[PDB]
Amino acid sequence: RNLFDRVLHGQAPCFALIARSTGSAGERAMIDVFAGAVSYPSSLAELPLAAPTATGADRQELLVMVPYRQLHERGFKTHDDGAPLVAITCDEHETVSAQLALAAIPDADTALGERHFDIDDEAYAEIVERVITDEIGTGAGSNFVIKRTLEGDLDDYSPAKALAVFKRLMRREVGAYWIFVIHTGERTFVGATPERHLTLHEGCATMNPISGTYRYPQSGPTIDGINAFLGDRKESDELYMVLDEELKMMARICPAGGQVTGPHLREMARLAHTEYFIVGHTEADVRDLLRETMFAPTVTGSPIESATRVIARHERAGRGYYSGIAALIGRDARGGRTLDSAILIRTAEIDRAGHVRIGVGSTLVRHSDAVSEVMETHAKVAALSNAFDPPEAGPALGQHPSVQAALRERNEGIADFWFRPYGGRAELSGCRALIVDAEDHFTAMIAQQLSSLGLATEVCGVHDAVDLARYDVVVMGPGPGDPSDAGDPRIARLYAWLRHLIDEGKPFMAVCLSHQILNAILGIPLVRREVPNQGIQVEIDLFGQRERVGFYNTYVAQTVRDEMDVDGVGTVAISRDPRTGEVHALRGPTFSSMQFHAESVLTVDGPRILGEAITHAIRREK
């Protein structure tokens, strides 16, 4: 793929990439790549075409761009904007697989700056009504097309940008006759046109009159919408008119006239069109065929000469190449003339300064509705406009302000500690704590918060033997299971630890499971909560202070008492929900306990709470 690579790296100053409608069933799509010399011939009669040659293979000779003003050759009048007749000799021609080629095209920002229609929707509606009332309504003819132009500016234009637009069009648009980027030096063209102008192969000429448009809803095409479209009298008349008008042209170019087939629905990305085909036989010279078919009635109107006059009366600007022709003129294997040509609609012309002009119109008929015709022009430019400014470039749903706010709110009224930088983040200063893990690594989190209070910490397991003299305070940790299940070895072992710490008067703080076990040791009932408090933030009164704490428990201790006296222990102060009797925490003579998890991300001010709990536990130490 050396030609393609050279077009890509700037080494082919004049080039065309054309993805055509020739491929078959389960074939990969291919892109024709052309390069050669540009010239500006002074008429169609002077296209630089050699005498007949045969190679044994199909071969293209020239790519010709015919502007609207070329109608002077038919003696018709036109606003002359100086758009030249352009011919590119096809000195080189290669084909490349679509997928590989597209992969090699680098993306580029092609957002259209100062994007606007030269004739805005309200002004365009008024023109449409004038054409219907003052042209159709006075006998100029039956249908006409009036161009308006979508305009914008490309920042920092180079043909790389045009290749990027072409790439998007190839990835998104369907139902096109050609998708192309043609760079002539003077100008760049990028488009996705649904309509051949004229083809010729082995004396067989084909035209494709297309009119009637179903605009897809943003949510997509539907069967009800397409059925209502195909039952619409205006849309069906419109197609019949352009069929008649292409039959006229075929009757002039082909001595036995044209034969119609179809109609067919052509489906594109943002709209569908109804179309017919016409075929016939001709042996006229390509130059004469091109001249005599300038330009299709689907993009001017009918009768053709009267349409040129309506067009001139209502368009202030010239048309450039809008409604014109891109024509590949060639030879077949054995030397007969070949023509493949497309109508220049759904196309951007980009000038050397990066200014983009996208011409668009619609077939206006006696029963046209001006507002619907405005909407039809937006539908027709939608795929090319999207190729410049893809709607997926816009902000994601995740960036919507309601989503960002909802996400930020999750962080309000939860633990500050865990959001603080790594490190980052007292009577307790000297203090050594042993944390006994009962098979829940919440312990590691209790240890980090205790360390921030100034304690040195060590973690063991329930089943280990330790020397308690090395510690000032023991933390009895959380864990799974039912605190009443004393025939589980691990739970039984928790009972033995708590009974020993109580009996020794060793300061301790009991968390969740160990809090529950402590309650049972002190004679307070345990019960299963009907709705488990497993992973919930609950506001509680904790010994006269309102706190917001994280719970992970299915079971709870329950009592009517705020204070009790317990044998072998002394007075135990109880913080409880006054409505249910559920126990939140205990303060005893040499210990504290909590049902909730101070260390959880769901506790507000966990370290302070843990500090208060430990401070209480060591109250008898001197």
Binding residues for pyruvate: 322, 346, 361, 380
Query: Which two three-digit tokens encode residue 101?
Result: 């080629």
Contact call for residue 532 and a copy of itself (CB under 8 A) = yes
Residues annotated in the binding site for Zn(2+), as ranges?
512, 552, 597
Coil, strand or helix: which one is 395? coil
Torsions phi, psi of 128, nearest 5?
Answer: -55, -45
Binding mask 577-606 for a copy of itself (x = CB under 8 A): -----------------------xxx----
- Binding-site partner at residue 213 among Zn ion, Mg ion, a copy of itself, none, CB < 5 to 8 Å by type: Mg ion
Nearer to a copy of itself, 160 or 260 (CB): 260
Sequence-distant (≥ 6) Cβ neighbours of residue 392 within 8 angstroms: none
Beta partners for 17? 33, 181
Nearer to a copy of itself, 291 or 616 (CB): 291
CA dihedral 161, 165, 170, 171 (to 10 degrees): 100
Element (H, E) at 136: none
Contact call for residue 368 and Mg ion (CB under 5 A) = no
Site for a copy of itself, residues 237 to 266, rule: CB under 8 A: 237-241, 243-244, 247-249, 251-252, 254, 256-266
Sequence-distant (≥ 6) Cβ neighbours of residue 502 within 8 angstroms: 521, 568, 569, 590, 591
Nearer to a copy of itself, 60 or 537 (CB): 537
Site for a copy of itself, residues 306 to 335, rule: CB under 8 A: 306
- Binding-site partner at residue 226 among Zn ion, a copy of itself, Mg ion, none, CB < 5 to 8 Å by type: a copy of itself
Q: Select the residue interacting with a copy of itself from 29, 30, 108, 279 (CB under 8 A).
A: 279
- Binding-site partner at residue 394 among a copy of itself, Mg ion, Zn ion, none, CB < 5 to 8 Å by type: a copy of itself
Angle at 337 between CA 193 and CA 170, to 5 degrees: 25
Torsions phi, psi of 114, nearest 5?
Answer: 55, 55
The residues of the shown chain that bind Zn ion, judged by CB under 5 A, are 478, 512, 552-553
What amino acid positions are annotated as catalytic residues?
512, 597, 599
Site for a copy of itself, residues 464 to 523, rule: CB under 8 A: 479-483
Q: Select the residue interacting with a copy of itself from 56, 391, 423, 544 (CB under 8 A).
A: 423
Q: Is the dihedral of CA 210, 213, 218, 219 positive or negative?
A: negative
Longest CA–CA separation in the chain, Å:
121
Report, in Å, the least distance between residue 177 CB and Zn ion. 31
Binding mask 25-64 for a copy of itself (x = CB under 8 A): ---x------------------------------------
CA separation (Å) from 52 to 285, 331, 544? Answer: 12, 8, 105
CA separation (Å) from 209 to 144, 250, 286, 360, 519? Answer: 14, 11, 20, 17, 89
- Binding-site partner at residue 512 among Zn ion, Mg ion, a copy of itself, none, CB < 5 to 8 Å by type: Zn ion
Site for a copy of itself, residues 102 to 121, rule: CB under 8 A: 102-104, 106
Q: Select the residue interacting with Mg ion from 293, 362, 386, 516 (CB under 5 A).
A: 362
Element (H, E) at 338: strand 337-343
- Distance CA(257)–CA(290), nearest Å, equals 17
In one-letter notation, the amino acid at residue 10 is: G
Torsions phi, psi of 291, nearest 5?
Answer: -60, -45
Contact call for residue 206 and a copy of itself (CB under 8 A) = no
Nearer to a copy of itself, 63 or 205 (CB): 205
In one-letter notation, the amino acid at residue 337 is: R
